[PDB]
Amino acid sequence: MLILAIISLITFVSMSKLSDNRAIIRLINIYLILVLVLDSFLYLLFLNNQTYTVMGELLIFNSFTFYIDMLIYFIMIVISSLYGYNLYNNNLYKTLFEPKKELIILFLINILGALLIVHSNDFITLFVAIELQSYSIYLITAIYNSSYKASKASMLYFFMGGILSILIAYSINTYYSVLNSYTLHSLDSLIINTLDLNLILIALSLGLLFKIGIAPLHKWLISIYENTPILITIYISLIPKISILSYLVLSNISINSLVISILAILTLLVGSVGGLLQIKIKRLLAFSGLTNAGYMMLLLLLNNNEFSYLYYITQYSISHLAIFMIIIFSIYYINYINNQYNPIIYVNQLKGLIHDNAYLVLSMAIVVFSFIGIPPLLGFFGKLNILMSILNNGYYFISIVLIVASLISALYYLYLLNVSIQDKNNILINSNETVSSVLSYILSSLIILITFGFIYNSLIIDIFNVYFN
Amino acid sequence: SGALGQKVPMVEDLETYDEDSPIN
Amino acid sequence: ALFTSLVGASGLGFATKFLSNKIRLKPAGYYPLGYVFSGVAWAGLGLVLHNVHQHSLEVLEKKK
Amino acid sequence: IAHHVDKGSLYRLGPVGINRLLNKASYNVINSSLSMNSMLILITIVSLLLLVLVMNVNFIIVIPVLISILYILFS
Amino acid sequence: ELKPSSAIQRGPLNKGGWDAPHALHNDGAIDRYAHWRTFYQERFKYTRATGKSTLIFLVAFPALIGYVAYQSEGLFEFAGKRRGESVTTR
Amino acid sequence: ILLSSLYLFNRILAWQGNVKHFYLFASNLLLLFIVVLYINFNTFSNSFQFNFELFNSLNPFGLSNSDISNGLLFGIDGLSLTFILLTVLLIPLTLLGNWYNINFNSNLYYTLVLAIGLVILLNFWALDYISFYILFEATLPLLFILIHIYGSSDSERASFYVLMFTLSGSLFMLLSIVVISIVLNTTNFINHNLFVLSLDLQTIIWLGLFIAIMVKTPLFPIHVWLPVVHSESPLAGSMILAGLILKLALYAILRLLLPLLCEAQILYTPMIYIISLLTIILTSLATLRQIDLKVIIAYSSISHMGIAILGVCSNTSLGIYGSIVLGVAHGFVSPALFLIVGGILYDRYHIRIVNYYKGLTTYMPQLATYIIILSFANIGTPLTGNFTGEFLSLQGGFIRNPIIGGISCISVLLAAIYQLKLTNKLTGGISSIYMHRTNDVTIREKFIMNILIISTLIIGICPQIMYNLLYWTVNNYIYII
Amino acid sequence: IRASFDKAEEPMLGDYPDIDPFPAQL
Amino acid sequence: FHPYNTLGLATQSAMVGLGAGVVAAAARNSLALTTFSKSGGVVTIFTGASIAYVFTYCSAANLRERKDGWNHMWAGAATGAVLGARTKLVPAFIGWTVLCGAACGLFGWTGARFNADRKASLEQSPKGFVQEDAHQTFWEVVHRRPLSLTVEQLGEGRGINAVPIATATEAP
Numbered sequence A: 001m002l003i004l005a006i007i008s009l010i011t012f013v014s015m016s017k018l019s020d021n022r023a024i025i026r027l028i029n030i031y032l033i034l035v036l037v038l039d040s041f042l043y044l045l046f047l048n049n050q051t052y053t054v055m056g057e058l059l060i061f062n063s064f065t066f067y068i069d070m071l072i073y074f075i076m077i078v079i080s081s082l083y084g085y086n087l088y089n090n091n092l093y094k095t096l097f098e099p100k101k102e103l104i105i106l107f108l109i110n111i112l113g114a115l116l117i118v119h120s121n122d123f124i125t126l127f128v129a130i131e132l133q134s135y136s137i138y139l140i141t142a143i144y145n146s147s148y149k150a151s152k153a154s155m156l157y158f159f160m161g162g163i164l165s166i167l168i169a170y171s172i173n174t175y176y177s178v179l180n181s182y183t184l185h186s187l188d189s190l191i192i193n194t195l196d197l198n199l200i201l202i203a204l205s206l207g208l209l210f211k212i213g214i215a216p217l218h219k220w221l222i223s224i225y226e227n228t229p230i231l232i233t234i235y236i237s238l239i240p241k242i243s244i245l246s247y248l249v250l251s252n253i254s255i256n257s258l259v260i261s262i263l264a265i266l267t268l269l270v271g272s273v274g275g276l277l278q279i280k281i282k283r284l285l286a287f288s289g290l291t292n293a294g295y296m297m298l299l300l301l302l303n304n305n306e307f308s309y310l311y312y313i314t315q316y317s318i319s320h321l322a323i324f325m326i327i328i329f330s331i332y333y334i335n336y337i338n339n340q341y342n343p344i345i346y347v348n349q350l351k352g353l354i355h356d357n358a359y360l361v362l363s364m365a366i367v368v369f370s371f372i373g374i375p376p377l378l379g380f381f382g383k384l385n386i387l388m389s390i391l392n393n394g395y396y397f398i399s400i401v402l403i404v405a406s407l408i409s410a411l412y413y414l415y416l417l418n419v420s421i422q423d424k425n426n427i428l429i430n431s432n433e434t435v436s437s438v439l440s441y442i443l444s445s446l447i448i449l450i451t452f453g454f455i456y457n458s459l460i461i462d463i464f465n466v467y468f469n
Numbered sequence B: 001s002g003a004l005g006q007k008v009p010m011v012e013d014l015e016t017y018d019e020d021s022p023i024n
Numbered sequence C: 001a002l003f004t005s006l007v008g009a010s011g012l013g014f015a016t017k018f019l020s021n022k023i024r025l026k027p028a029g030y031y032p033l034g035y036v037f038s039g040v041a042w043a044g045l046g047l048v049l050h051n052v053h054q055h056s057l058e059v060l061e062k063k064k
Numbered sequence D: 001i002a003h004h005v006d007k008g009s010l011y012r013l014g015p016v017g018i019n020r021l022l023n024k025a026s027y028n029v030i031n032s033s034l035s036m037n038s039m040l041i042l043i044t045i046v047s048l049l050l051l052v053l054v055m056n057v058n059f060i061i062v063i064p065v066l067i068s069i070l071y072i073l074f075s
Numbered sequence E: 001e002l003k004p005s006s007a008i009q010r011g012p013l014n015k016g017g018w019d020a021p022h023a024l025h026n027d028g029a030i031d032r033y034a035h036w037r038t039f040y041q042e043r044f045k046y047t048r049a050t051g052k053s054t055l056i057f058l059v060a061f062p063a064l065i066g067y068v069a070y071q072s073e074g075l076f077e078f079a080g081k082r083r084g085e086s087v088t089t090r
Numbered sequence F: 001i002l003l004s005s006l007y008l009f010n011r012i013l014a015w016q017g018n019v020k021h022f023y024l025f026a027s028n029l030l031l032l033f034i035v036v037l038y039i040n041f042n043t044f045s046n047s048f049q050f051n052f053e054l055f056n057s058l059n060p061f062g063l064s065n066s067d068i069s070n071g072l073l074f075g076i077d078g079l080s081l082t083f084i085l086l087t088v089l090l091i092p093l094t095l096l097g098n099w100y101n102i103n104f105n106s107n108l109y110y111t112l113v114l115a116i117g118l119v120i121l122l123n124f125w126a127l128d129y130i131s132f133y134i135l136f137e138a139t140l141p142l143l144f145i146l147i148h149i150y151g152s153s154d155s156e157r158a159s160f161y162v163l164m165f166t167l168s169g170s171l172f173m174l175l176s177i178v179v180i181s182i183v184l185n186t187t188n189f190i191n192h193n194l195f196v197l198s199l200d201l202q203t204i205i206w207l208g209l210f211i212a213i214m215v216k217t218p219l220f221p222i223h224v225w226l227p228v229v230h231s232e233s234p235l236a237g238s239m240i241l242a243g244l245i246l247k248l249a250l251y252a253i254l255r256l257l258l259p260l261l262c263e264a265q266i267l268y269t270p271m272i273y274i275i276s277l278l279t280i281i282l283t284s285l286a287t288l289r290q291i292d293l294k295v296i297i298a299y300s301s302i303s304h305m306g307i308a309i310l311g312v313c314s315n316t317s318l319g320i321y322g323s324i325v326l327g328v329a330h331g332f333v334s335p336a337l338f339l340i341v342g343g344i345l346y347d348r349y350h351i352r353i354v355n356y357y358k359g360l361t362t363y364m365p366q367l368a369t370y371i372i373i374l375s376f377a378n379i380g381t382p383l384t385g386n387f388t389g390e391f392l393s394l395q396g397g398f399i400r401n402p403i404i405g406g407i408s409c410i411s412v413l414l415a416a417i418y419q420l421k422l423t424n425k426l427t428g429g430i431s432s433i434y435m436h437r438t439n440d441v442t443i444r445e446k447f448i449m450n451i452l453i454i455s456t457l458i459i460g461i462c463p464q465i466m467y468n469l470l471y472w473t474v475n476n477y478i479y480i481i
Numbered sequence G: 001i002r003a004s005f006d007k008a009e010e011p012m013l014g015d016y017p018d019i020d021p022f023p024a025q026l
Numbered sequence H: 001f002h003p004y005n006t007l008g009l010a011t012q013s014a015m016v017g018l019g020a021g022v023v024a025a026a027a028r029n030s031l032a033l034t035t036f037s038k039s040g041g042v043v044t045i046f047t048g049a050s051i052a053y054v055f056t057y058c059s060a061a062n063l064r065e066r067k068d069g070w071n072h073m074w075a076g077a078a079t080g081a082v083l084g085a086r087t088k089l090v091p092a093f094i095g096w097t098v099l100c101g102a103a104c105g106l107f108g109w110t111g112a113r114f115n116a117d118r119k120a121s122l123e124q125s126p127k128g129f130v131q132e133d134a135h136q137t138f139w140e141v142v143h144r145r146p147l148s149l150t151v152e153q154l155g156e157g158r159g160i161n162a163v164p165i166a167t168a169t170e171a172p
């Protein structure tokens, strides 16, 4: 469906005027919803963990990739709604959030790149999908060319992504030179015992992981996330993380790797410690993303990581979307718009939000306490599954470090709630304006999922036991 | 005050000047 | 019980609608037809999950 | 007791000492948008190669090096 | 050109309530003494006296009690002990 | 029922505008319901009785009768019933003690208070490690919000302490719970004494569990958060925290630790005795040089919890019974003292510095009588439950280790010192010049304090009245070959 | 100022008056 | 336990630390003959940390004839002493010593490894309930343990006796 959407959309966006952008985006939003609901029944193919190799052994289809695919569609639906609908109908918000003409096509193509990364069974397909996603994401960074910071960001991103892509291509070709093969499926226990592939496979893993910004190469990505338009940051900080991490989890090429162990430790420490002194909202959220990417990196050191990883990535996607949407909503109550790409920038600008919108702060509290991992919110069960996995496999020191990093990051998670439940002198008296029904309903759905997902935990594990065993 | 109680209103993290600000 | 699952999922839909009203700075019963709509939709999702889970249990039992 | 232990040492190994430590460490990790980042990526690649060479030699010898690296970055 | 919506009307946050007559006559000296004592941890420094109290109570006293408690574990049994019998088990 | 009751709640809210009458009524109904349960509770059996399961896969939204149990387990025995009765006794008084001094966002405040109470009450019903942990952490967001919004001047730091210290301990508790889950693949409390882990593994799990216990009880040397969180909490937060949340720790020892890690507990007991003797002596001494009323009352609780711990790890029936009775008596007395210092004096004068207060007997003789009674109860006068608890706990501790228990007998003296030093200045002397005359204690305040006083006196004159619920428990956990 | 324990506290005050204490009973 | 060659291992560590400090100095230069002038003493940081950690670790391991986390605790204490000497203040020196020693002691306790020892881990170990009369291994569980094992591990006294009381005090 995705290819058909891309083709049609190119035709229409060519033949439509600049005023039709939001209507087009609503059209695609509904189309993706329709695909998600009508084609969901293809799950049935994956009963008993049945795996399918497709396209001449280039693509691999199993329950895991089907789930990642559905999750990516859900994320795309939510993200496209933010562009397809106005928060408010005033002039200010027409200036604040207007979709570019080609933005939707870039979004769909980057989604296609991500899905091809997930399904990749062969290194040529992996490299082509990586380059497709990398190019589309460069352009998404750069499409808002009136922003000085966005253009500077796109250029830095181009160069860092190019270097990491060259590292990846080098790793692929060294694997070819040693094994005369482009598939990991050719690998076996005998082959891993016989030959020392550790260097090559770790170089490939590192080349992929530095593209989502794990320490000690974080800062360039945090700067890019800071300097992009806020509705762009909601996307570019999420989809590449999902695709790359899912590919690495599915491939399992760094089991018990000492280098990945040390880098995951370092990423946890830097993500937790470095986010403490932050005063800008989006830099705080980017360091949050770094710490959570560390939590997921830990899962690359062990076999049978499917359940913990899927649960964690789903709850993280929901929490991330929700926190960005809350920051977006809280824009209507700020008294100073900093600029047209990033209306709110400093955490202190939320001060006293509870007096303007009590339930917005309720939602904020719920999402923050999910991030900290307070039961019975989803975040707690995500961390619980991760701890179960790593302790089952004897990563004791890493478990201690994970404890410590969650503690430390709770400080700058609660910074947001702290300033949000403080008091502001000028308190909204009244307003005729209504927030858009659709986005408020979506934000509410995310909040209710985070709050009451745990009631379905046992049902989920029962389903999982029949589709992934 | 910040998340550590430190004073809050150069490194990019604490830099306040805004090249995208409408007045610049 | 299927009826209990439908009641629960509808309760989730009602919660979503109520939270949506409050987030819009609106009264709890601002648009009462939205409660019915959201309850029906979330009950549909709950029903789908229930059918999938029952089928999964059936498959697990049939391999015995 | 009440001052020197309770509001002294126990707060050192508590909210106040941790606050100071985190302030310093965070300041150091935040303390030419391109050239610098490129130098970073080379330094990471070469440092990783040399560190793994050392690890192959003897893992005990690399622990002080990692400690020193973290001391550079955070302190 | 970027300004919040004119549609918003903001008034004061008043907390309401009945202003009671002020039944305490605050003493500035007492308040400063109280503030100094309350936030003593912000100004604590390690000196010879402070370090001495730290090393006594956090180190020497726990060590003494630990030696006592691990040396005397299971040593005594008193229930109904009679004349000539040893109240010690080892 | 639930639909109709929700309708009733909505209508009452729309018409009256303040939920607090509805919450008071509700909590009273809950108390009556628990009493009905006690009526129908069989005491000649060591088995959990009112069992039910939630979030089972066959019935996610209802109760499960399935042959596979993958949800969360709930049920009660005598030990849980005692603390549940304490909880349902305390909750309505917690609502009532702030009946007039909250004049803003009052509905939210009462909602947070009642939610915290219900969370603790449900926590006592939990029958497996995961649900216990879930409800054990669920309070921290509510406490954080409550303290931050409705607290005194230094409430921001208080809220951050109460969240961070408890999370810090709870995550090591989570490590231990994860190890148990993956090693046993079971989590329940019903049959967890049947699994005999290797001694080394027991020794390792015990560490995480006991770190959680150190932060939550608290014990020396990680007790420094409690005096803050108490002093800047509003009255309901302080009463709940002192009267229930600390007893959650003692219940945690008895339920989670002793049945599973018996041999490791035997190995580690002298370390526990070191830590408890430390907390008693050192916190009791540190109480002498405090200048805040609520801080002093907070420091008292830590020492009493130290005596409770010394009782509960004594490996004797008398020690365990003493720990339970002391927990209950402390849950009666400490909320009363917190009521005094943070609801009567603080609501009349809005200050907590000790220097301002003096000679309150002249204008407020009734308040002075209440202070005298509550203070002699807190320091352990016989015919009060506190004395029975401290005496039995000290007996168990002296049996377990004669030297350590004998030294711990100094707690009687130390408690008398700090408490009577406070009440001496508060009650007598010439009426203070800094403050003016205000009303004496009112009917509501007197009602709450009378409830607490009669409860502690009743269990102090005849502590046996609790035995029918606890005679199984006093044998269920001692490890003698 | 006079007693050893008061002297011990002199580094721990910043911008608080170093008072010479006199027993109020005397 | 057969000894570490303290002298040799410490010499190799000196070499590694010197090289690492050189690399850090070159980087530091590039990011800011002046490289060592404006080094900040990082070469000394690396060299001293290396020598201190390795020398103290081997020394302690040889003296105690054991290999466990305590050796890492001592070595971390020495490393922290070196790193905290740079502050030139006694409280900071003591703090670095004790806290680095504690952190490294924790590290050595968990296995002195950042990745896992796969063969010893639970996933690769015999688990579950044991069979008929087999010896208990670390991850295994039973329904009853042998009383002699209790008496030997826990020790006699405090209610631990070779024979149940009622049996021993039975009359005939």
Ligand SMILES: CCCCCCCCCCC(CCCCCCCCCC)(CO[C@H]1O[C@@H](CO)[C@H](O[C@@H]2O[C@@H](CO)[C@H](O)[C@@H](O)[C@@H]2O)[C@@H](O)[C@@H]1O)CO[C@H]1O[C@@H](CO)[C@H](O[C@@H]2O[C@@H](CO)[C@H](O)[C@@H](O)[C@@H]2O)[C@@H](O)[C@H]1O
Residues within 6 Å of the ligand: A395, A396, A397, A399, A400, F172, F175, F179, F200, F201, F204, F207, F208, H067, H068, H069, H070, H108, H109, H110, H111, H112, H113, H117, H120, H121, H125, H136, H137, H138, H139
């Ligand atoms: C709440 C505070 C948390 C802090 C404490 C956590 C630290 C855990 C330490 C305990 C523990 C993991 C236990 C994990 C349990 C759950 C984890 C708990 C949560 C994780 C956060 C790590 O044990 C480590 O101890 C270190 C010394 O301190 C050693 O350091 C190194 O020493 C040198 C190398 O030889 C080097 O010189 C250097 O590399 C280091 O110096 C390590 O080699 C060693 O693995 C023990 O695990 C292991 O124990 C052994 C025998 O016990 C088990 O095998 C047994 O074999 C027979 C006898 O062997 C028995 O007859 C048999 O019955 C049993 O089969 C194993 O199966 C395995 O299980």
Ligand SMILES: CCCCC/C=C/C/C=C\CCCCCCCC(=O)O[C@H](COC(=O)CCCCCCCCCCCCCCC)COP(=O)([O-])OCC[N+](C)(C)C
Residues within 6 Å of the ligand: A036, A037, A040, A041, A043, A063, A066, A067, A070, A071, A074, A306, A307, A310, A311, A312, A314, A315, A378, A449, A452, A453, A454, A456, A460, A461, A463, A464, A467, C009, C012, C042, C045, C046, C048, C049, C052
């Ligand atoms: C009418 C069609 C509408 C279906 C549209 C689905 C859209 C997905 C969008 C976002 C993902 C959001 C949550 C996914 C739920 C997992 C389903 C599943 O059970 O996960 C399992 C695998 O468990 C796992 O690994 C762990 C999953 C981690 C979930 C973390 C959140 C838990 C709390 C969510 C509670 C659910 C809300 C219900 C409220 C009444 C895959 O199940 P499956 O591959 O057999 O497909 C299901 C059959 N299906 C296609 C017809 C729907």
Ligand SMILES: CCCCCCCCCCCCCCCCCC(=O)OC[C@H](COP(=O)(O)OCCN)OC(=O)CCCCCCCCCCCCCCCCC
Residues within 6 Å of the ligand: A375, A376, F050, F051, F052, F054, F063, F115, F118, F119, F121, F122, F125, F134, F135, F138
């Ligand atoms: C947010 C924190 C995390 C949340 C995790 C858990 C949330 C749970 C939500 C609360 C729901 C639990 C209370 C209702 C469940 C019990 C209903 C019931 O029917 O009891 C079952 C039990 C057996 O009944 P049955 O087998 O049907 O036989 C009847 C014979 N005539 O019959 C009985 O024996 C009676 C049992 C009495 C139970 C007393 C419960 C005390 C408190 C009740 C309300 C608590 C609500 C908590 C709200 C805050 C969230 C914790």
